[PDB]
Structures are given as C-alpha cells and as structure tokens.
Design an enzyme around this catalytic site. Structure first.
Site, PDB file in Angstrom:
ATOM      1  N   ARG B  55       0.827  -1.203   0.000  1.00 40.96           N
ATOM      2  CA  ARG B  55       0.000   0.000   0.000  1.00 40.96           C
ATOM      3  C   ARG B  55       0.862   1.254   0.000  1.00 40.96           C
ATOM      4  O   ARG B  55       0.471   2.276  -0.583  1.00 40.96           O
ATOM      5  CB  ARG B  55      -0.950   0.000   1.206  1.00 40.96           C
ATOM      6  N   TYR B 108     -13.365  21.047 -13.452  1.00 41.17           N
ATOM      7  CA  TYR B 108     -13.869  19.752 -13.885  1.00 41.17           C
ATOM      8  C   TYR B 108     -15.126  19.384 -13.109  1.00 41.17           C
ATOM      9  O   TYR B 108     -15.149  19.476 -11.882  1.00 41.17           O
ATOM     10  CB  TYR B 108     -12.765  18.717 -13.647  1.00 41.17           C
ATOM     11  N   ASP B 182      -5.506  21.786 -10.519  1.00 44.80           N
ATOM     12  CA  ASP B 182      -5.620  20.665 -11.448  1.00 44.80           C
ATOM     13  C   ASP B 182      -4.848  21.044 -12.707  1.00 44.80           C
ATOM     14  O   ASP B 182      -5.314  21.832 -13.533  1.00 44.80           O
ATOM     15  CB  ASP B 182      -7.082  20.359 -11.737  1.00 44.80           C
ATOM     16  N   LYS B 207      -4.674  11.233 -18.808  1.00 44.59           N
ATOM     17  CA  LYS B 207      -4.664  12.017 -20.053  1.00 44.59           C
ATOM     18  C   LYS B 207      -3.279  11.934 -20.625  1.00 44.59           C
ATOM     19  O   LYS B 207      -2.919  10.870 -21.106  1.00 44.59           O
ATOM     20  CB  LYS B 207      -5.159  13.418 -19.773  1.00 44.59           C
TER      21      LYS B 207
HETATM   22 CL   LIG Z   1     -13.695  14.287 -20.361  1.00 45.16          CL
END
Ligand SMILES: [Cl-]
Ligand SMILES: [Cl-]
Ligand SMILES: [Cl-]
Ligand SMILES: [Cl-]
Lengths: 391, 392
Positions: B55, B108, B182, B207
């Site tokens: 972990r 977002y 972000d 992304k």
């Molecule tokens: Cl998206």
C-alpha cells in the site's frame, strides 16, 4: 455448489468473447458511435453499459458480476485496496454529526480512518467488545448510523455472534447501516448478506488474489444500500484497474482448492500448538475453546489459514530476534492470504494500544501465523525449531 | 539539462531499473523482512522510500514518484487510481468540518460534484470564482477558507488563470491557505505550478502522462510544506496506484515530449483555421490570441497540449447534432482526452451554464470540444470541413 460457482461466476460470453476468462479491456475513453449511443450509455453508465473507464470496462463488469453472485449482493464496488474499500464504504454512509460503532478488534488502519479522518469531519466513533452479542443494544446512540463488524477480529481472531448483534442493532436502530470486514472468510466462508448485514467488505489483496502480488478492495452491498455506496464511492474516484480486476476474477477460480488446504493445514497446526507446553492459548476460529468458536462452527462453512497463538512467556527483544530471524519457511511480512506462510509478533501492550474501550487478557508474546500451501509437516518442523530456540 | 533529456531519464535510477532501461515491475502486497532489525528499519522509513508494504509502494512506485517530483519540482508525489480520486482525496486531506473551499467555477465537473455532494455533508462549504478574477479574488477569501482550488486552463471552456495575481492575492489575506491546481491540461510540465507558489499540483495521468487512453492514474505533487499531510491522509483513505499502471505512467513520460509538441503544432494550426471560419463564433484555445487568459498562457506556460474548444455560429438542433457528430471519419465521440487519437464532444450553452456555479455563460452557439491527436493535421481539418458542410 460453491466450487462450480467459483469456477463460473462472471464468465458470461459477453465478457469472455470466446476465451475462458474475461477479456482485459484497458480504457479511459469508451467510444460512442452516435449521439443516440452516447445517450444510451449515459443513461446506463451505472448499469453495465460501457461509458467511461472510471465506471469500468467489460473486465470490471465481469468481476462485479462474479462478486455479486458469490456474496449474494445487489452490487459490488471496486477499490484499489482493502483499506480504500473500508474507508470509502464507511464514508459513503456518514455525514457530520453521525456516529460509528466499530468492533475494537477492527483492523488497525480501519480504526485509524475513524479516529484520524472521520473525527475531523464531525463523525464520531465508539467501540464494542467482539463478544458483546446482544448487549450491543445499549451502545447504539441516537446518532449511530454505521455499525462496523469484523469477524474473526484482526490479529486476535475473536468471532462475533452476528445473529445476536444484528438482531440487537435492528431493535434499537432498524435503519442502521451494518457493515462487516469479511476478508478472513474471503466473503464466501461467511455469507454476511444472508445474516442481515448490509455491506460485506473484503481486502481482495488477501485470499481473492491469493498470491500476494496485487491489491484490491471490494464492497458488496444489498439492494437497499448499493446505489448510495456506488455513487458516493464513485464521487471519491474509487476504482480498480482493469488488469487487477482480471487477476481478482482469476483468483476466484482456485479459491476453493486454496482455502480447503489453508483450512486443513492451519487447523492441524493449531491443534498441535494447543497441546504444546510453550503455547498458552491458540486463537483459531476453528479450534474448540477459541473465542467465539461456537459462532464460527454454527455460522461459517469453513476456515481460512490465518490465526494466532500466545506463547507461554513474554519474549525479550533478544529472544524475539532469535525466534523470528531464523525461521526457514515462515517469513516476516505484513498481509496474508497468499500461497506462502508468514509470521508476525506483537507484545501484549502493542495489542492493548489498538483495543479501544478494552483491556487485553494475555501476557505472553502473541504470534500471528498465516499457514500457506507448503507441506504441513515442514511448517510444523519450522515452528518446532523456533520453540527450541526460545525454550 | 533540458526537459526532453529529463523526460527520458526521470526516475530511472539503477536501484529501480536493475539493468533494464525501465524500472522493474514489483507486484506486491507483502514485502518480506529478513530480520526484526530489518523490519524496524523499514517501519521507520515506510514513508521514505524503503520497502515496507504494498500500500505504501514497491520499487515501481518509488521510481514513478521520483520522476514526478523531479519533473514538477516537488517534495513528494502521491499516487491515486485516477485523477478524480487524486482531486477528491487531495482536497479531503486538508479540510476539516467548518472549513471553506474556494474553487474556480470552471473546475472539472466531477471535482465540483465532489465538493457539493461529499464535502457539503461533512461540514465543508464550497464557493466559486470567475477564472479571470485575478487579484480581485482577495474579497472572496473567508476567515475559514482552507483550500483555494485552481484549474488553468478551465475544463471545456479553457479560460487560463492569472496565477501570479491569484496567488499573490490569496497569500496577502490567507498566507496559510492550501493553494491547489488541477494541472492536467499542462501534463504538469507545461506550467510549473509549484514554481508559482501553488502548494500542490494535481494531474489526471489518465490524459497525457499515459498518452494512449488505456490506463487511469492520478498524481498529486506537493511542496515540502504540504507533502507530509497529503501523504499520510491520502494513505489513511487507502489511496494508491497499482504497480503495473505506475510502470505505464513512467513509460508514458518518455514520449511526452514528442507527443505534446505534435499536439501543440496540430491543435494550434486547427484553432487558427477555425478562428477564420465563418461557421465558428469563437475559438477557446489557450495558445490562440484573443482567447480568455491567452496572455497569461503566453507569459506563464512553456507550451500547449492538444485539447481545446470552439463555439459554432449557431445552436444546433438535435437532428443537426446527430448529422454533425455521427458522421465524422476520424474524430470519435468519447470522454477523456490526452491520447494519440482525436476526439469530439458537444455541449449546449445551458449544459455549460449548469456546471458554472453562481455564473452564466456568455455564448449561445453549440460548444464543440476537440482533442487533437497524432493523425495527419490535414486529414483532421478535412474531417472538420466535412462536418461544417453537413450543418451549413
Ligand atoms: Cl472528459
Ligand atoms: Cl434507525
Ligand atoms: Cl497485516
Ligand atoms: Cl492563513
């Protein structure tokens, strides 16, 4: 029968596409051919239509179908590890002012999530003895929202009387969210959702994976709780990668043959330890005399391979090293549920520190064993050599 | 010295690679301690790059964390199963009941939804600001403001913050605020957020870090001030990334230069052509002059990626929407972006207005978001030109 279910659960043709196992579909973007197809996927993004990788691909859908069948639930949420599953499943059902009632034998990171994260968000937590049974009623507060079980308990292996606990909770708070960490049973040796529990949580890291090389949390909820679990875990971005989802499904296929061996070998070793002059007590759910053993025999359909025992003395630091450092087959490591055998030691005060609202009842050094798939006489020989080093 | 050499080499220390070019993939939950002394040492250093528990990470995770810290200039890098998990859990790691979050209204949508559907019920309030507010954000910082959340460029509409003006204003009124961004559109490297006095730079590695649309991963690189709290509180939520995706994230870094340069050249060329087009009312590309906050992009960024949007000269009805979108040859409809292929999505003005809290939109045409992939840019233009032909 369960062995047939373990082999077949989740392996529908729409996921396997001709192979024995599901395909591995690695994806963030999922392509819509038309505006109408995108609208349909949007409407069905929580119902097994391809929409976005965070919701899942064919590979996730297949594992979810398997866990729902094996654990008898309405939905299954996937997490990157067991601790994530515990933390985020609890979080999905609380708001500021709520109260959590958790067994004081809960896995330590589960306790720490409550005392370090929930507490600063206005969610309080209290504790109960694992053998409290029907007397848990008096610990339910007006603001109690979640009752969190773990049977057998972490490290010390006490088994709950879940029918008594559930009946008593429902008498005082019928709409409470009752959850259990069902890792020891791999979710199949104790059918939690058949016992009035709302959500069954597992560190698939342990027996579902079964090889100590992947981490995964799962939470299977009944119909009442599934949409809230699903959507609130999703709001926290909780998901499992497609490849680990595949490996979790794959681990199911050998879960039966593995658990039967873990049960046979660990009970044999536990029985031998219980006759041993250097052993004060054996904490194995399947061994008569162990705390809550009668509940294990009545409510479980088998045992796994993890248990503990208390030595006849408290080891000093020199003896602890001489004991632990020189095992040939048992290895020191955290986690368990794999094919190899592990050993870990805790002194009584180390357990006392993680037993809130309780006191420990032993003074010897506690040894937790995971019994793997090695030859049981070889594992016994390893343990006997260790006893010789500390006699 | 230069960024391309750093992208090729970041994180590839011999302790991790062990003779191969890339790090080994160490799949593990259990990590074995040879002795009690070894377990004690690992326990002491379990947050310090020593093998302790899966972990916490294996060699594969340590290699990626080293690369992200080097590329983004941070003290530590936390890993998450996706970008949405990185956002939700990085905010959660710093807020407590009674706190206030100040978030750009161009955030977002899942980031907004986390604030209004999760944080709200935990006694953490959220309010919003226009992305171009600049130094005027001071009046919006409350006594209980704990987090200021940026996203530059914004989602969908691509407004670029004046980060220097915003940060200086926040520091004046609340120097202890946790400023987060972000930074996904920049892939964390086209805008060096931590060099601008931002505390934590968050990325959907999904992304451009991954770059092939086939893995999900979130990262959050924090400065020395905020790293220990981010680390330990994300860990208490069980946040981690699987070893194999960690390897694939490190692997994506190696082509991030050649990819971004192609995304930049191709998307800016297409944006320039769209800006001259009679069927286009506005082009939202940070690199295009006249775009909202473009002057901040030119001053503060060192490049562009391939994601942008434009507004059609009219509002398409549902039949036109299908005729337009359904018949593209190369652009595909899907969520996410940052991969090698080109994508297209549409939003009506009121759809965007719904995700602009306490604000209205300033356009009435249908909004089209494009991700420009690695296809031949003339082919992509012809595909768009054929789309214009269907709705003329
Ligand atoms: Cl998206
Ligand atoms: Cl109730
Ligand atoms: Cl453990
Ligand atoms: Cl301050």
């Amino acid at each position: 029968h369960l062995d047939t279910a373990l082999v077949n659960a989740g392996r529908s043709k729409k996921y396997t596409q001709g192979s024995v196992n599901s395909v591995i579909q690695r994806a963030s973007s999922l392509v819509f051919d038309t505006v109408e197809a995108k609208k349909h996927a949007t409407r069905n993004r929580a119902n097994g239509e391809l929409f976005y990788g965070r919701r899942g691909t064919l590979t996730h859908f297949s594992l979810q179908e398997a866990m729902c069948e094996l654990e008898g639930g309405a939905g299954c949420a996937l997490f990157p590890c067991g601790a994530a599953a515990v933390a985020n499943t609890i979080l999905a059902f609380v708001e500021q002012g709520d109260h959590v009632l958790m067994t004081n034998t809960a896995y330590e990171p589960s306790q720490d999530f409550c005392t370090k994260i929930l507490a600063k968000l206005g969610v309080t937590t209290s504790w109960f003895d694992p053998l409290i049974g029907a007397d848990i009623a008096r610990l339910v507060r007006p603001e109690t929202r979640v009752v969190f079980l773990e049977s057998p308990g972490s490290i010390t292996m006490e088994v709950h009387d879940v029918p008594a606990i559930v009946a008593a909770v429902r008498q005082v708070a019928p709409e409470a969210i009752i959850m259990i960490d069902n890792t020891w049973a791999a979710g199949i040796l104790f059918k939690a959702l058949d016992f009035g529990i709302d959500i069954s949580i597992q560190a698939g890291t342990k027996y579902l994976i079964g090889h100590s090389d992947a981490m995964v949390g799962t939470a299977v909820a009944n119909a009442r709780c599934w949409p809230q679990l699903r959507e609130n875990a999703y709001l926290m971005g909780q998901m499992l990668d497609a490849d680990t989802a595949y490996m979790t499904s794959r681990g199911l296929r050998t879960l039966g043959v593995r658990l039967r061996q873990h049960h046979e070998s660990s009970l044999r070793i536990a029985e031998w330890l219980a006759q041993h002059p250097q052993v004060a007590r054996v904490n194995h759910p399947a061994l008569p005399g162990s705390k809550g053993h009668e509940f294990w025999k009545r409510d479980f359909t088998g045992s796994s391979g993890l248990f503990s025992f208390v030595l006849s003395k408290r080891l000093n630091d020199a003896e602890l090293a001489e004991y632990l450092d020189n095992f040939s087959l048992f290895s020191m490591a955290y986690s368990w549920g794999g094919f190899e055998s592990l050993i870990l030691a805790n002194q009584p005060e180390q357990i006392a520190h993680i037993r809130p609202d309780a006191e420990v009842d032993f003074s010897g050094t506690l040894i937790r064993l995971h019994i793997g798939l090695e030859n049981v006489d070889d594992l016994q020989a390893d343990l006997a050599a260790g006893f010789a080093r500390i006699v």
